């Protein structure tokens, strides 16, 4: 029975060919949302767009890469071909290697701060003003709960989630005047395909026991509070982050 | 367009009759929770209770006391002769002195204590194993921005709300195996009839320059995350604080 | 060498006859501050005095029960007659019962909101002006890790050390004027005389596994913290929620 | 009278030529701690040491840039040389453009990201092993209140800091086995040689209206916090963010 109230625009999910976008993707676009789903594999971000229209929805796909800033800039000008763009989903995000601080790769580090965090930057300078210049609306960006708390061995991981917060922060502070709302949400360990296919049992209990609920989340339980904070129904919601984590960070 | 999914159950809304409680209470019902308003103010109670059946909804009052342990009880089996109970939201709530610390008087620190912490908790012992033989559900208290930061001359509402933060957590964390999901919501400052009946001009302009959307919030606004939040697209949701606040906490 | 900018003042510490209380009031004696050690245990606090007074320090006992309002003010006239009252520490607290929130009996839940939450309030009460009154200083209020995050079926005494950080909050807001600053202090689990008597060698290593220290905490480690924050090397510390946890709400 | 168990090691402190980093830098070795002071201005460090060695202590200056990875364990070296390096603070800061996220420009983005993020992760790397080999230690990170909320214009600078929290709570779990211990500060606004030159009154009195203590802070009342969390001390203290803000965060 879930309906967003997110029709009439054009939402940007970057990252939406599979897992939690591929689900943003979708509740945004039964919704009525026009969804241009970026992501740096085409044949994913082409498989999730295909889903939406057989459904009955609109959407378009745009393969490229996100720490290109100039990527920013043509998903904001595609988006608003379909519709007005007020709802930007910045989604996309690696894990990055499993090392302590001290032994982490200097590229690795730098490559999770780029596209975890300054990915997401350069994707906000080009929203901001265009769902402003749209009557306002909204940027949800995907931190984790790893934004409030650390996780051995994903430094860099945590470090850029943590970042997000911030960024949110100084962006909803600073539209507002525009009515452009931005939120961070952060989900706890959710069963993607990198989950189902790589993680060994062991692995999974573990995870499982610290969360509340005993389980991992699924991709459409992150999706619905995406849509929500991305829709009408959240005009107050601004500056603040919103985990869906199963009671992760409650002990 | 905004609909939750919350049908085939009943609701406790605690201060349903007015404000954000009635709010919340109207949109519960217009997407097919059978609500059960209590109130202190029957006359109130009664008159949501008849804006929700006139609109083809479902809705019974019980007007009474929650500081009364026994008034919690008698709700759940008022509302289990709807629906299977499966929402609770405890918003009944006072402002309480204005007054500091030192000068608080002691009667006006308890009762405020009494209701805003002490009448939560006694719902939640009646809510909690009634929602869990219901095959689980949600429970939403509501605490406020005043359960993160303070507010001068209002510190039992404060410390109480504080408190609501805590209880929220532990009955999460104590429940989740029954699928029982606990979570807090926090309004910034609100129009209520409280609000626009008696706060003077240049009170409005101050608590307005405090939330940078420049204006206080409205019920609706507080309602929407509060039925997301109950509703079965929130099923990864526990444990956790919300806030609805305009940006006030983001500075 | 730690040495605590304290002399010149007296400093109330309640609890102060055993544990972690008996630390802070010990290393704050060490420092130079007149210590009035006040307990329900008349034997404990006699017993703390003594060790301050054989090693060259200054103190008095007051026995009796923080839960009673004039038993603040007397122990703030009992500190003044040693020197000026600068600083307290409202430590006194109690478990309370083991039992899930649906289950928590109601006596339990009043006893441990009274001592843990409304002993504080009466504290303050009298704390707050008198510490004005000399010239200003510093409230430590303990509270816990369970200020910030959950633990099942000790509801209460999460809910009322949640509630200290929203009174701490308010006060430092109200009486930063007059110089009076107000802190929390959040100690993880520590081995006291309780853990050291009573807990059972599975318990130990389950919380030891929760801190990434790997052990519990000493009262030496809580007590430099405590004496710290109500030293004049914090004067700009208000507000604020300290935690001394070994890294239990890290992760 | 306050004096810090901080004698018998050496410590790095960047930034230390001026401002917070001075009076670091000063209070660190009027304590024994033989310091390694680090700063860009070769000018400001040595005229540091000098001030340490005059007053009878023993320090060293190193002058050079944070960014580079290699002067992080240039830094590391030569402070191992004076005493083991048990204490590493990463103070260097830029404050960056004052930008709207849209507007800001992405070499000032960078910039600040490199100094204010990558520079501290930089110096860990070489810290966190050299600190674990003589024993363990402690690593303060200088983050700022806007580590957890907000400040127009200024998005580069907040996400860094926020970034910082996730970085100290990330090397504080990986490294607590080896009993180094990693803590964030957060100042309030202090009044630096920055602030008194530069600022104009309008400026200042906004400032110092959102701290609840009326007034900026000093420089010697956060370098106190830093030489608390250095010491032995604060043996329990590790991973938590520690705020020096005057009640600004409180509301
Ligand atoms: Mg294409
Ligand atoms: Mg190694
Ligand atoms: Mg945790
Ligand atoms: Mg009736
Ligand atoms: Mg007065
Ligand atoms: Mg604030
Ligand atoms: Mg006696
Ligand atoms: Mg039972
Ligand atoms: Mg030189
Ligand atoms: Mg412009």
Same mark, same amino acid.
């Given at each position: 029975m879930a309906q967003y109230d997110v029709a009439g625009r054009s939402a940007i999910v970057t %990252? *939406? *060919? +599979?897992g939690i976008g591929r689900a943003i993707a979708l509740t945004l676009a039964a919704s009525g949302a026009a969804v241009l789903v970026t992501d740096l594999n085409e044949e994913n971000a082409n498989a999730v767009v295909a889903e939406i229209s057989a459904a009955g929805g609109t959407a378009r796909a745009l393969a490229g &890469?996100? /720490? &290109?800033?100039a990527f920013a800039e043509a998903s904001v000008a595609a988006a608003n071909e379909l519709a007005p763009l007020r709802i930007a989903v910045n989604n996309a995000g690696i894990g990055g290697a499993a090392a302590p601080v001290g032994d982490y790769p200097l590229d690795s580090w730098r490559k999770v701060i780029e596209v975890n965090l300054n990915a997401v930057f350069y994707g906000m300078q080009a929203q901001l003003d265009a769902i402003g210049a749209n009557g306002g609306g909204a940027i949800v960006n995907m931190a984790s709960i790893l934004g409030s708390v650390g996780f051995a061995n994903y430094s860099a991981y945590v470090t850029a989630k943590h970042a997000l917060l911030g960024l949110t922060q100084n962006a909803a502070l600073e539209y507002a005047g525009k009515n452009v709302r931005v939120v961070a949400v952060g989900p706890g360990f959710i069963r993607t395909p990198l989950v189902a296919s790589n993680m060994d049992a062991d692995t999974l209990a573990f995870l499982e026991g610290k969360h509340a609920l005993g389980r991992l989340g699924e991709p459409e339980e992150v999706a619905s509070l995406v849509a929500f904070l991305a829709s &009408? =129904? =959240? +005009?107050?919601? /601004? %500056?603040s982050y919103h985990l869906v984590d199963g009671g992760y960070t409650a002990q």
């Open positions: %990252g *939406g *060919g +599979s &890469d996100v /720490t &290109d800033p &009408d =129904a =959240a +005009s107050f919601i /601004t %500056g």
